[PDB]
Amino acid sequence: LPLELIDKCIGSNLWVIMKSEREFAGTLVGFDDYVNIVLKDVTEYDTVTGVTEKHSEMLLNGNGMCMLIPGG
Amino acid sequence: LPLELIDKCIGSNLWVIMKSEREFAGTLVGFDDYVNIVLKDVTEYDTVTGVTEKHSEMLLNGNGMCMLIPGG
Amino acid sequence: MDSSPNEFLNKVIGKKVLIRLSSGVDYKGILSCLDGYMNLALERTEEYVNGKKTNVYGDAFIRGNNVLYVSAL
Amino acid sequence: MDSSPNEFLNKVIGKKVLIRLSSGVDYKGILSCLDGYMNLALERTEEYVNGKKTNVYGDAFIRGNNVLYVSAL
Amino acid sequence: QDQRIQATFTGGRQITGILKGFDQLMNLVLDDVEEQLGAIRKLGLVVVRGTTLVLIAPMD
Amino acid sequence: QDQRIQATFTGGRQITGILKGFDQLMNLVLDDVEEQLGAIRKLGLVVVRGTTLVLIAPMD
């Protein structure tokens, strides 16, 4: 089950790939039925420009995400 | 009410504007709660390339639509 | 509101349909079945980018919620 | 699953947040309230395209379901 | 309500119009709509989809 | 199921992987995933979102 796998990842580092050219890596805090997720200590990666940004904590919207990858 | 206005348009011509650079004009047949709509005798307009295409009938997905305009 | 979308898809089961993505990719295939959520099972499907056939699928599943449109052929 | 998203938004009510769109537009503003659907009421909001402040809003409504992310500032 | 508002869409599209109604899903009815293309197009009476609606704010 | 499949996403992204599970909303679990970028990247175990999933088909 997709959502059971995601649930196993709480407190651990997650790698997220958007349909746009952006990736996020952070610590999964929790998520809702729609897989809107909350991440802590996040690195945002712009995969075209190469630009990186840090975030203490964020609600990452699930609509534009392609993949969530346990690990980083 | 948005959905009551759309309901008034059934059997009549509707103009639809997508978030992408595309427009549709056709006869509204019906729609669901999510405003996925069915159109008849449709003209598809690519607003960049200027290319036009005809359709006898189509299910036009509501997720990418910005606006529905009663008339054409 | 009603179930006009599902009625339309049922009406075209067993026929060829054109499925467009907002990206501009087109699929032409035979609609075999659907569920109530507009998930589509396709047979004998051709994929076109820029008018060039780019692939074929004997069977494909297509998530109707994520396409631009399904058009009767 | 739980209500971690709504918990996060409640935790940051009255604070400045960064709201990014997939287009690359950024909003920085004060979160006043939200509803259960992640519709957001903002105050004192600045809009940035390509790092240039492009507009300000004393009050704006923002549809949280349609943004890329809301980040604590 | 009955106020002129501006709206932006997930695609980047921007419009302006008078709010006449709305629903739980954030579909709106706007009158006298104008889309900023520095040109503009008048669109009249429109239904705005909450599915692509990002921002709603008073005029300016 | 346990078959290798290919998948395409609303963004244009394309991947390949072994189907291990899925749910009513069309989220999938895939193992041994590879994204076609003519290069490729190996991604291992992934959860695919039904929210951007367009196409699923057998290998080839």
Numbering used by the authors:
A (entry chain A), B (entry chain A): 6 to 77
C (entry chain B), D (entry chain B): 1 to 73
E (entry chain C), F (entry chain C): 32 to 68, 78 to 100
Excerpt from the publication:
Sm and Sm-like (Lsm) proteins have been found in all three kingdoms of life: bacteria, archaea and eukaryotes. They are essential parts of ribonucleoprotein (RNP) complexes and are actively involved in various steps of RNA metabolism including pre-mRNA splicing, mRNA degradation, telomere replication, histone formation and translational control. Members of this protein family are characterized by two closely spaced, conserved Sm motifs 1 and 2, which adopt a conserved Sm fold that consists of an N-terminal α helix followed by a twisted five-stranded β sheet. A common characteristic of Sm/Lsm proteins is their tendency to form a hepta- or hexameric ring structure.
